[PDB]
Design an enzyme around this catalytic site. Structure first.
Site, PDB file in Angstrom:
ATOM      1  NE  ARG A   1     116.697  34.398  24.932  1.00 52.18           N
ATOM      2  CZ  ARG A   1     116.247  34.969  26.029  1.00 52.18           C
ATOM      3  NH1 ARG A   1     114.960  35.041  26.322  1.00 52.18           N
ATOM      4  NH2 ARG A   1     117.130  35.488  26.878  1.00 52.18           N
TER       5      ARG A   1
ATOM      6  CD  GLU B   1     112.754  36.919  28.283  1.00 56.67           C
ATOM      7  OE1 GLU B   1     111.966  37.011  29.286  1.00 56.67           O
ATOM      8  OE2 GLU B   1     113.975  36.612  28.423  1.00 56.67           O
TER       9      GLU B   1
HETATM   10  C1  LIG Z   1     107.717  27.823  20.035  1.00 49.92           C
HETATM   11  C2  LIG Z   1     108.934  28.413  20.747  1.00 49.92           C
HETATM   12  C3  LIG Z   1     109.453  27.675  21.804  1.00 49.92           C
HETATM   13  C4  LIG Z   1     110.519  28.175  22.546  1.00 49.92           C
HETATM   14  C5  LIG Z   1     111.081  29.419  22.216  1.00 49.92           C
HETATM   15  C6  LIG Z   1     110.530  30.245  21.181  1.00 49.92           C
HETATM   16  C7  LIG Z   1     109.466  29.663  20.395  1.00 49.92           C
HETATM   17  C8  LIG Z   1     108.801  30.342  19.227  1.00 49.92           C
HETATM   18  C9  LIG Z   1     111.285  31.507  20.867  1.00 49.92           C
HETATM   19  C10 LIG Z   1     112.582  31.135  20.236  1.00 49.92           C
HETATM   20  C11 LIG Z   1     110.601  32.572  19.999  1.00 49.92           C
HETATM   21  C12 LIG Z   1     111.473  32.163  22.276  1.00 49.92           C
HETATM   22  C13 LIG Z   1     112.252  31.331  23.082  1.00 49.92           C
HETATM   23  N1  LIG Z   1     112.118  29.941  22.974  1.00 49.92           N
HETATM   24  C14 LIG Z   1     112.732  29.106  23.959  1.00 49.92           C
HETATM   25  C15 LIG Z   1     112.169  27.847  24.261  1.00 49.92           C
HETATM   26  N2  LIG Z   1     112.643  26.995  25.190  1.00 49.92           N
HETATM   27  C16 LIG Z   1     113.815  27.356  25.765  1.00 49.92           C
HETATM   28  O1  LIG Z   1     114.378  26.531  26.533  1.00 49.92           O
HETATM   29  N3  LIG Z   1     114.474  28.461  25.489  1.00 49.92           N
HETATM   30  C17 LIG Z   1     113.987  29.371  24.623  1.00 49.92           C
HETATM   31  O2  LIG Z   1     114.705  30.373  24.341  1.00 49.92           O
HETATM   32  N4  LIG Z   1     110.983  27.450  23.659  1.00 49.92           N
HETATM   33  C18 LIG Z   1     110.191  26.399  24.331  1.00 49.92           C
HETATM   34  C19 LIG Z   1     110.706  24.974  24.036  1.00 49.92           C
HETATM   35  O3  LIG Z   1     110.780  24.752  22.609  1.00 49.92           O
HETATM   36  C20 LIG Z   1     109.821  23.940  24.679  1.00 49.92           C
HETATM   37  O4  LIG Z   1     109.919  24.123  26.106  1.00 49.92           O
HETATM   38  C21 LIG Z   1     110.239  22.492  24.322  1.00 49.92           C
HETATM   39  O5  LIG Z   1     109.480  21.590  25.148  1.00 49.92           O
HETATM   40  C22 LIG Z   1     111.729  22.233  24.466  1.00 49.92           C
HETATM   41  O6  LIG Z   1     112.022  20.932  23.912  1.00 49.92           O
HETATM   42  P1  LIG Z   1     112.543  19.757  24.901  1.00 49.92           P
HETATM   43  O7  LIG Z   1     111.305  19.264  25.644  1.00 49.92           O
HETATM   44  O8  LIG Z   1     113.018  18.713  23.925  1.00 49.92           O
HETATM   45  O9  LIG Z   1     113.604  20.363  25.783  1.00 49.92           O
HETATM   46  O1  LIG Z   2     112.560  34.036  25.139  1.00 51.40           O
HETATM   47  C1  LIG Z   2     111.519  33.551  25.617  1.00 51.40           C
HETATM   48  O2  LIG Z   2     110.479  34.228  25.442  1.00 51.40           O
HETATM   49  C2  LIG Z   2     111.464  32.352  26.206  1.00 51.40           C
HETATM   50  C3  LIG Z   2     111.395  31.217  26.656  1.00 51.40           C
HETATM   51  C4  LIG Z   2     111.277  29.962  27.137  1.00 51.40           C
HETATM   52  C5  LIG Z   2     112.280  29.354  27.905  1.00 51.40           C
HETATM   53  C6  LIG Z   2     112.091  28.096  28.443  1.00 51.40           C
HETATM   54  C7  LIG Z   2     110.885  27.401  28.224  1.00 51.40           C
HETATM   55  C8  LIG Z   2     109.856  28.035  27.478  1.00 51.40           C
HETATM   56  C9  LIG Z   2     110.088  29.282  26.947  1.00 51.40           C
END
Ligand SMILES: Cc1cc2c3c(c1C)C(C)(C)CC=[N+]3c1c([nH]c(=O)[nH]c1=O)N2C[C@H](O)[C@H](O)[C@H](O)COP(=O)(O)O
Ligand SMILES: O=C(O)C#Cc1ccccc1
Ligand SMILES: Cc1cc2c3c(c1C)C(C)(C)CC=[N+]3c1c([nH]c(=O)[nH]c1=O)N2C[C@H](O)[C@H](O)[C@H](O)COP(=O)(O)O
Ligand SMILES: O=C(O)C#Cc1ccccc1
Ligand SMILES: [K+]
Ligand SMILES: [K+]
Ligand SMILES: [K+]
Ligand SMILES: [K+]
Ligand SMILES: [Mn+2]
Ligand SMILES: [Mn+2]
Lengths: 500, 500
Positions: B170, B279
């Site tokens: 995010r 979240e």
């Molecule tokens: C689908 C999705 C995945 C989010 C995500 C959201 C969505 C919709 C949001 C944006 C709505 C809410 C927050 N997100 C975060 C996130 N991972 C993270 O490290 N920080 C986040 O803020 N993820 C999870 C992340 O994409 C997965 O853990 C991947 O495995 C990270 O890729 P990597 O293995 O290459 O690190």
């Molecule tokens: O903002 C969130 O809801 C979130 C998140 C997140 C962070 C690390 C791995 C997977 C989800």
């Protein structure tokens, strides 16, 4: 007679409600009736009334399945329960459980003895019946016997005559004039049996009444306190004295409108093979036979065109969930309040196979206690798990005021997000365990002891200063004006009734 | 261009599927767009496309909400996911996850560089945009900023150029030319950031692409292994090399058909306020702001009539459940198999707010291991909870072959009935914890450590001689001929379509 006071009237009520299917073609009590009933319970369909049961002779018997199971619609989901209690069919679970608890601070209304009733329309003596010749159902294909008794009421009285207990406990046919069944601690039928065994003089006078007043079968399924005669509790709850007739061969009293009555004795010496059975948690362990209590039948009396209620129990949702779980939860709610714990509501989530109870906490009261999770969890578990009302429940989930414990999805959300595994839980190994849960009787540990937990899904500030979040949902994460605008424009934009 | 390879084509695909609502009247990005989207996600309605967003100027931007959320019908429940991957809309979860895992034993197909693409149709330099003037949504009423980034792909490369990672994390607007966002261990964007910080010479070259190829956003959401470039994994999965264009201000490469591209740097020195946010676990803690990573934006390029995808995340069901949970579960399934554990299937139940994963065990293989619950639970938890793929998951539930882990009701049944609390569980306190779960970051214990459990819902004979029960259900407690007769006569008797 009113539907809540007469089983025959209750059947009519289900017909009026468009909540009955009458099957007038031949149905086999060997598995078919229970299979249809099982399907009904797994799909929340209409209750089946089997009017043409293969093997029915001289009026014994028709079967009603699923008498306390769920309806499909959300609006009248618990309507079959409501019809046990004179409540509107749209009654909430909270309203049903409040009705069931209402008599707990009322004077009992003792029963009225009347000289006769419909249950005396027909009789069969010791030379005229054979329980192996009746159309007793085989309910599940691996059951160890034909379970005649799934929704009747056992009637036993303390030796001193001061307590007459009504309860549901299963029993199956042993031979032409005996049943075997479950009689286990801490249940009242077991407590009373123990009294007679210590006296050592005679077998326990007994009756089993099928198709009793619906309000009476509800109390039969509830863990009301030790020593409390169910008849007078039901009397108080309904505001009317129940009419009872004396048995012919003993001095017990049965509801006047009982469909079918067995009279006899519960042995203080003999046992016989019992089970296995397809049980409330959803399993049968084929071949798992053990010795159960043994009942001798001396006389049968019954109504013309008698109807036997039957619970085809197992996986969700049937009477073992809607009644056992919910009524235990009700009693637990009251028990907690009488122990000065700030509990407002209790329910056994169906998703937990009624092995959990979620306790909704008045967190304003909690905050004034100036306590901690570890202390509060211990207090709650000591009260509930050391009492009979807690017998069937292995996990208590504490939740704050934002959670509706009658909504499984919200209980699962709170449990999954607010209770840290381990740290936020207290395990109880030195309490009575419920052996019928598979992980108890067929598990890795003692069948009869331990395996219980209090899981605290209260968040830390709920003990101190108050809730410090808002839900990330439509209801809590948007202002009222905007929410109403969205709702008002919903169908106009292109997006998608209460009764359904 | 195919729907799985081009976001604009994906939007058309949802329209064709009758799975889109186009809203052409003005909608406010201040809460209204996200409120509509939230309602859609809580009711499994059609995805909303906001074509007239208050504040859109010079083509920036329309919004698509709920791009990876559920459809109402059971038959095409996961159809939006299937449309990310060229799968039939009726694809099962097992088929979607197998597609996402398929590239794990294929040679990567590296991307193809092309000289231009639709993402270059428009551009704004350092003097021509202001991120505070764009119609960035306020998604939840208590959010600490306007979260521009909920469904775009961050692109960062290791200093040595050998690994280019694509991931969703995010980010919110900080000021006219900066974002702040979450960059936390063990995530790949954090691992790469650390590499640049140790080198100490410059900020991390960065791009953020919104409206990327659907197959690419799926891999962006999956914990594929360390060091593996997502572009070549997606290439292998789809059987086609992805077409990428170079950024204008750095040497990173973005999908040619990206809707909107930000180019700039991720600071190795600066932080700024980030959050709070509504979240994935369903909560916002208002006022809970902390320092997050800080991104500088130098250039924006974008398609004519650019569309910004948006996740209005929180309570069930949205992309944070359907993608984060399911794709972690997929990777965990593979990780267990590569560690010689007899796991056939894995899924994160929605009921657990995707904090659990249910692991289906091949119990024939388990029996040949001649092991015990305590040993097996320890082995499984050590593999999963010491790996990045296990990061988000706090409870593993081991179940035997009779359980479909893709069915929450069956997972809850098995957990509730087959796992003795305490005795059948192993707690893991010395593993990385997921702080975003409320009971972690806002709980009673360390935010970053522990709070994990393996819950063994295998029954004892599943380790030795084989399952020794039958379910007390319609399917298992009645013979086939009888079941079919009941089904064939169901409507004839008076009781109650697949597509719906
Ligand atoms: C689908 C999705 C995945 C989010 C995500 C959201 C969505 C919709 C949001 C944006 C709505 C809410 C927050 N997100 C975060 C996130 N991972 C993270 O490290 N920080 C986040 O803020 N993820 C999870 C992340 O994409 C997965 O853990 C991947 O495995 C990270 O890729 P990597 O293995 O290459 O690190
Ligand atoms: O903002 C969130 O809801 C979130 C998140 C997140 C962070 C690390 C791995 C997977 C989800
Ligand atoms: C609704 C219901 C309740 C059953 C029951 C069933 C149903 C449908 C069956 C018959 C289908 C399956 C088994 N039953 C048993 C049972 N209690 C018990 O001790 N043994 C049992 O075999 N109960 C629970 C019992 O009725 C409650 O625990 C009461 O509190 C017992 O009354 P008591 O408090 O007066 O002892
Ligand atoms: O046969 C069963 O399913 C059962 C039971 C039971 C026993 C004691 C208390 C509650 C239910
Ligand atoms: K009772
Ligand atoms: K807690
Ligand atoms: K990724
Ligand atoms: K177990
Ligand atoms: Mn009693
Ligand atoms: Mn990666």
């Amino acid at each position: 007679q009113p539907a809540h006071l007469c089983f025959r009237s209750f059947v009519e009520a289900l017909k009026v409600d468009n909540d009955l299917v009458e099957i007038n073609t031949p149905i086999d009590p060997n598995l078919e009736a229970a299979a249809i009933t099982r399907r009904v319970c797994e799909t929340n369909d209409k209750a089946p009334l089997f009017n043409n049961l293969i093997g029915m002779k001289n009026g014994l018997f028709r079967i009603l399945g699923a008498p306390g199971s769920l309806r499909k619609s959300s609006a009248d989901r618990y309507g079959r329960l409501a019809r046990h209690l004179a409540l509107p069919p749209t009654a909430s679970m909270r309203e049903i459980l409040d009705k069931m608890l209402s008599a707990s601070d009322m004077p009992p209304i003792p029963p009225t003895i009347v000289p006769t009733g419909p249950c005396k329309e027909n009789s069969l003596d010791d030379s005229e019946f054979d329980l192996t010749e009746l159309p007793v159902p085989l309910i599940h294909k691996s059951d160890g016997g034909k379970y005649i008794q799934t929704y009747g009421m056992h009637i036993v009285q303390s030796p001193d005559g001061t307590w007459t207990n009504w309860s549901i406990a299963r029993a199956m046919v042993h031979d032409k004039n005996h049943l075997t069944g479950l009689v286990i601690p801490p249940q009242h039928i077991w407590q009373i049996h123990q009294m007679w065994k210590k006296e050592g003089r005679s077998d326990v006078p007994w009756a089993l009444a099928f198709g009793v007043p619906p309000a009476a079968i509800m109390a039969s399924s509830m863990p009301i306190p030790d020593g409390v005669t169910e008849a007078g509790y039901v009397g108080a709850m309904t505001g009317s004295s129940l009419e009872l007739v004396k048995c012919d061969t003993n001095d017990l009293y049965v509801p006047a409108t009982s469909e079918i009555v067995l009279e006899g004795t519960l042995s203080i010496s003999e046992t016989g093979p019992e089970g296995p059975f397809g049980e409330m948690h959803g399993y049968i362990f084929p071949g798992d036979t053990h010795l159960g209590a043994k009942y001798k039948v001396n006389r049968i009396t019954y109504r013309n065109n008698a109807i036997m209620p039957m619970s085809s129990c197992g996986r969700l949702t049937d009477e073992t969930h809607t009644m056992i779980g919910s009524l235990a939860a009700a009693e637990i709610r009251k028990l907690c309040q009488q122990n000065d714990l700030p509990i407002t509501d209790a329910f056994a989530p169906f998703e937990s196979q009624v092995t959990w109870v979620a306790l909704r906490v008045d967190t304003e009261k909690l905050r004034a206690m100036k306590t901690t999770s570890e202390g509060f969890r211990k207090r709650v578990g000591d009260v509930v798990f050391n009492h009979k009302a807690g017998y069937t429940i292995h996990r208590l989930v504490l939740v704050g005021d934002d959670i509706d414990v009658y909504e499984g999805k919200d209980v699962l959300w709170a449990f999954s997000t607010r209770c840290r595994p381990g740290m936020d839980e207290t395990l109880f190994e030195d309490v009575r365990g419920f052996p019928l849960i598979p992980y108890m009787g067929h598990g890795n540990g003692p069948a009869h002891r331990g395996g219980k937990v209090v899981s605290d899904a209260l968040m830390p500030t709920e003990y101190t200063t108050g809730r410090n979040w808002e839900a990330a949902d439509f209801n809590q994460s948007y202002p009222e004006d905007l929410k109403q605008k969205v709702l008002d424009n919903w169908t106009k934009m292109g997006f998608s009734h209460h009764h359904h």
